[PDB]
Amino acid sequence: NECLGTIGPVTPLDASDFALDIRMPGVTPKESDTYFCMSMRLPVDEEAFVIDFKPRASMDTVHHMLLFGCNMPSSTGSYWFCDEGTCTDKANILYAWARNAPPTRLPKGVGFRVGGETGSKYFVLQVHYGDISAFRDNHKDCSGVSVHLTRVPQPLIAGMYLMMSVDTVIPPGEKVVNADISCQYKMYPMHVFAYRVHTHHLGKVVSGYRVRNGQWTLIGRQNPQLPQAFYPVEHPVDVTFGDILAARCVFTGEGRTEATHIGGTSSDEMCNLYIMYYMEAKYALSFMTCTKNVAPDMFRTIPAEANIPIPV
């Protein structure tokens, strides 16, 4: 309503569905590269399924938008700067939009489970504004995302497998440092349909693989300095009990003056790989994580592909 929109925060869509319009409350970025966050509580207490998204991004300023599910947003204000945090509990990523990135429309019969016993009670929207022009000091923006929710159970439930490196340091000036992550998979099958990579400025490339009986199958690989949206996996990759998930983040220590710790508690660097999957609903869970390298020896046999740069 802060930009004269008539659409309420909740619109029923027929018997069992509703749309949630999650939009900035008329914010004003005053400096380039500004991340704003806001929260939106789920109007239902029982479980519901997020089945579609529609981005409502302003023409020019907005570069990137992320949507998370969590139970405790970092603030109770109408908005906040995301540098304060997104959620104080675990922020579960559900959606990314980057201008000019490939979209990732959820496959048919797939939804994220929210609400209920296990599910997230809030969405948190992050909106990244890039360079802003002079003379926009009193402009109000209501960028965001509309979310389609249904109470109809979906046969396939979407989730996120988060791979993160926390054991590796980049010594200053070392041209190439690899951070390797690996975990055994021990659940019912997941089918990986998209992925997103995240590092700070020293990242060169991030790759994730499923390894089964010694064979490596690419899930995805990208340069983390490109827009951190979800890139679609052209052919979804099935990951099953007894497979290993393996990732390698390639970094540089060039230009650095001190050691740079990857995944440190006061970061400086990170390597995160977000693997968006679906699972058959009655066996599904909504998130899984790997924060170690259980099979470091395996990375001697890694495909040469994983070391090839994906420039600029």
Numbering used by the authors: 45 to 356
Article excerpt on this structure:
Two enzymes, peptidylglycine α-hydroxylating monooxygenase (PHM; EC 1.14.17.3) and peptidyl-α-hydroxyglycine α-amidating lyase (PAL; EC 4.3.2.5) working sequentially are the only proteins known to catalyze this reaction. PHM, a two Cu enzyme, catalyzes the stereospecific hydroxylation of the glycine Cα of peptidylglycine substrates. The two copper atoms in PHM, CuH, and CuM (located in the N- and C-subdomains, respectively), each use a single reducing equivalent from ascorbate to catalyze the reduction of molecular oxygen for the hydroxylation of the Cα of glycine at the carboxy-terminus of the peptide substrate. Crystallographic data on apo wild-type PHM and on several crystal forms of three CuH mutants (H107A, H108A, and H172A) presented here show that the copper ions are required not only for the catalytic steps but also for substrate binding and for locking the overall conformation of PHM in a configuration that is catalytically active.
As a step toward this goal, we have determined the structures of the apo-enzyme and three His variants at the H-center-H107A, H108A, and H172A, all without the addition to Cu2+ in the crystallization media. All of the PHM structures published to date contain two copper ions. As expected, there was no density for either of the two coppers—CuH or CuM. The final R-values are Rwork = 20.9% and Rfree = 27.3%. While loss of both coppers in the structure of apo PHM has no significant effect on the conformation of the molecule, mutations that cause loss of copper from a single site appear to have significant effects.
